[PDB]
Amino acid sequence: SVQIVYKPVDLSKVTSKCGSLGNIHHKPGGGQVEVKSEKLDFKDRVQSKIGSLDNITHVPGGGNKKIETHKLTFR
Amino acid sequence: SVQIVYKPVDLSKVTSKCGSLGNIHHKPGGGQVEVKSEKLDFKDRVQSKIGSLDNITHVPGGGNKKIETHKLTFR
Amino acid sequence: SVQIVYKPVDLSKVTSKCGSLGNIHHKPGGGQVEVKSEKLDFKDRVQSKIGSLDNITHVPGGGNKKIETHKLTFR
Amino acid sequence: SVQIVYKPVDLSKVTSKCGSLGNIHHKPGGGQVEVKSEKLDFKDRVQSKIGSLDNITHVPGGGNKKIETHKLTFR
Amino acid sequence: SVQIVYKPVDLSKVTSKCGSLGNIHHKPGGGQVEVKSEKLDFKDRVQSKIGSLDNITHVPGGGNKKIETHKLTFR
Amino acid sequence: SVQIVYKPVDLSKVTSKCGSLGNIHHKPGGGQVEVKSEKLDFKDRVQSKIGSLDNITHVPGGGNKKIETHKLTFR
Amino acid sequence: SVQIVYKPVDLSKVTSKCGSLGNIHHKPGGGQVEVKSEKLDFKDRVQSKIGSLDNITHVPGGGNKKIETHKLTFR
Amino acid sequence: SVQIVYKPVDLSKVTSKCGSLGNIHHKPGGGQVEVKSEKLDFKDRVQSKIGSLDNITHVPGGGNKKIETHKLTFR
Amino acid sequence: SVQIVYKPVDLSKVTSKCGSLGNIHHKPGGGQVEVKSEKLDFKDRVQSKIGSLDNITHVPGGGNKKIETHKLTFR
Amino acid sequence: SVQIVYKPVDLSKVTSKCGSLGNIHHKPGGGQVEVKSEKLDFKDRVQSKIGSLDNITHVPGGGNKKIETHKLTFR
Amino acid sequence: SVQIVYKPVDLSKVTSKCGSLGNIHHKPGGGQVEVKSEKLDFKDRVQSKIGSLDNITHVPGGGNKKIETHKLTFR
Amino acid sequence: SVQIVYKPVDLSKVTSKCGSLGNIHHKPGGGQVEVKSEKLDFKDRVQSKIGSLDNITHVPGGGNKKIETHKLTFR
């Protein structure tokens, strides 16, 4: 005398694709680099780098959440 | 005497595509770089870089949420 | 004597595409670069860069939300 | 009393680039194809094809010649 | 009393690049194909094909000749 | 009283690059294929094929000749 | 109550006659031939012939087709 | 109550006659031939012939097809 | 109540005659031939012949097809 | 004291060519011939001929005579 | 004391050419011939001929004579 | 004390060519012949001939005579 047919269907396809992806870098070339320093004074913290060709992918992001609560109640 | 059919169908395709994607960089060239520093004084914190060719993908973003509650109640 | 047919169908296509995407960079060339500094005094924090050809994709954004509450009740 | 200085310099760059080159074909999609043939008759030679998506690069050409004769004589 | 210097310099860069080259074909899709042949009759030679997605590079061409004679004579 | 300096320099760089080369085919997909044949009569030679995804590089070409004769004579 | 007579008569004399046919050549004389070649040079393909008398009959053509469907139907 | 007489008569005389046919060549004469070659040079393919008299019949052609389908149907 | 007579008569005389046929060559004469070669040079493939008289009959062609069908059908 | 040199040279080319020579008679046709004769009387010798086509070559002539004498007498 | 040099040279080319020589007769046609004779009386020798086509060559003549005498007498 | 050199040269080539020679008679046709003779009377010798086609070559002539005499007489 009561029929309950709780029959939800989920095919949802939550997707994330982040950073250097599916690319061609055929023949990249860094140039020649020279750094000359004589009588530098630093009173405080130094961060530095020197290079010619840098290729960098960082990607802090690209995360996913699925929250999917299902409830049925009767009385 | 009572029939409840609860048959929702979800095919939702939540998608994120972020950063350098599907590109051609055929023959990118960095030029020659010279840095000459003589008699410099820094009273405080220093950050620097010296490159020639830099390729960079950062992507802090591109995240997904699906929040998807399903409820049926009877009395 | 009562029939309820809760039957929503979802094919929602929530999509994000962000940054350098599907591009051709054939033969980009950075110029020759020289920096000369003699007697610079810095009283406070310094941030710098030197390069010839920089390619940068940042993308802080491009995130998605799908919020999808489904409810049925009876009495 | 006689000085001959035969000194030709050649940097000739004879180049050929032929057919589908450096292209992006993102998402080409062939249609559905049906061929129905009932009661046919062929008295002579038959050539056929049935595709949906064909990508073809032929290039019979694109060849190079450099013809470079160098002569010096004396008497 | 006679000086002959015969000093030709060749850096010639004869080059051929032929057929599908440096391309992206990201997501090419063939459609569905049906061929129905009932009551056919062929009195002479038959050639056929039935594909869905075909990718073809032929390149009969793209060949090179460098022919480059050098002569010095004296008397 | 006679000086002959026969000093030719060759750096010539005859090059051929032929066929499917440096490409990305990221996710190519052939479609479904059906061939139905009932009461076919072939009186003469038959060549056929059936497929779904074909990738073909043929390259009859792309050959090189370098022919480079050097002669010096005296009397 | 129905008489069908199908009595086609074919007497056709389809004929082809090609090349040197039904000739007299009485006393054809080739003359004296001399070729002197001193200091020749050929960078590419050579085809030659040297002779006093040639009587050459080629005939690539001269073929025949008869195509002759006959049909009778009743109901 | 039905009479079908199907009585086609074919006497057809499909004929091909090709090349040097039914000729007199009485006293054909090639003359003296001389070839002198001193200091020749060939970089690529050579085909030659040197004779006094040639009588050459080639005939790539002269073929026949007869195609002659006969059909009677009743119902 | 139904009489079918199927009496096709084929006396067809499909014929081919190719090449040097039915000829008289009474007294053909090749002359004297001389070939002198001193200081020749060949960098690639050579095909040659030297002769006084050639009587060459080639005939690549001259073939026949007869292709015939006879259908009688009743119901 | 006496020299006699009797040294005649005879190259004489005495030649005869008579009758049906070097012809083509291709398709010569004699017509129908009929003779009817009821009650004829012949009182003397009869010579008679009937026929459709005649190709008579008779040649009672065409002969050669060479009458030659060589005499040396001395005293 | 005496020299006799009797040295005649004879190149004499005595030639005859008579009758049907070097012709083409293509398609010569004789007509229909009919002869009817009731009650003729012949009181004398009969020579008679009936026919449609004749190609008679007779040549009673065309002969050659060379009467040659060479005589040397001395004293 | 006396020298006799009797040294005649004979290369004379007495030649005869008579009758049907070097012809083609390709497709010569004699027609139909019929002769009818009811109540004919012949009172003397009869010579008679009937036939469709005749190709008579008779040649009573065409002969050669070479009468040659050599005499040397001395005293």
PDB file of C-alpha atoms in Angstrom, chain J residues 38-69:
ATOM      1  CA  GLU J  38      21.344 -24.524-126.805  1.00  0.00           C
ATOM      2  CA  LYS J  39      21.954 -26.120-130.262  1.00  0.00           C
ATOM      3  CA  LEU J  40      25.323 -24.796-131.531  1.00  0.00           C
ATOM      4  CA  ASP J  41      27.196 -26.615-134.361  1.00  0.00           C
ATOM      5  CA  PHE J  42      31.026 -26.482-134.692  1.00  0.00           C
ATOM      6  CA  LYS J  43      32.437 -27.884-138.013  1.00  0.00           C
ATOM      7  CA  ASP J  44      36.164 -27.436-137.122  1.00  0.00           C
ATOM      8  CA  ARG J  45      38.676 -27.473-134.189  1.00  0.00           C
ATOM      9  CA  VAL J  46      37.431 -25.643-131.033  1.00  0.00           C
ATOM     10  CA  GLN J  47      39.536 -23.974-128.329  1.00  0.00           C
ATOM     11  CA  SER J  48      37.422 -22.587-125.412  1.00  0.00           C
ATOM     12  CA  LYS J  49      37.900 -21.029-121.930  1.00  0.00           C
ATOM     13  CA  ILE J  50      35.558 -19.822-119.140  1.00  0.00           C
ATOM     14  CA  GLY J  51      36.587 -18.302-115.779  1.00  0.00           C
ATOM     15  CA  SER J  52      36.063 -15.447-113.287  1.00  0.00           C
ATOM     16  CA  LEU J  53      39.582 -14.080-112.438  1.00  0.00           C
ATOM     17  CA  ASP J  54      42.951 -14.440-114.290  1.00  0.00           C
ATOM     18  CA  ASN J  55      46.422 -13.171-113.184  1.00  0.00           C
ATOM     19  CA  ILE J  56      48.609 -14.310-116.152  1.00  0.00           C
ATOM     20  CA  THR J  57      52.385 -13.556-116.355  1.00  0.00           C
ATOM     21  CA  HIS J  58      53.820 -14.890-119.665  1.00  0.00           C
ATOM     22  CA  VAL J  59      57.480 -13.638-120.208  1.00  0.00           C
ATOM     23  CA  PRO J  60      58.799 -15.245-123.456  1.00  0.00           C
ATOM     24  CA  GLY J  61      61.537 -12.515-123.325  1.00  0.00           C
ATOM     25  CA  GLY J  62      63.922 -11.091-120.678  1.00  0.00           C
ATOM     26  CA  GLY J  63      67.102 -13.106-121.599  1.00  0.00           C
ATOM     27  CA  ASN J  64      70.763 -11.881-121.520  1.00  0.00           C
ATOM     28  CA  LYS J  65      73.878 -12.342-123.760  1.00  0.00           C
ATOM     29  CA  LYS J  66      77.449 -11.350-122.719  1.00  0.00           C
ATOM     30  CA  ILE J  67      79.839 -12.063-125.634  1.00  0.00           C
ATOM     31  CA  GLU J  68      83.372 -11.225-124.480  1.00  0.00           C
ATOM     32  CA  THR J  69      86.868 -11.612-126.001  1.00  0.00           C
TER      33      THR J  69
END
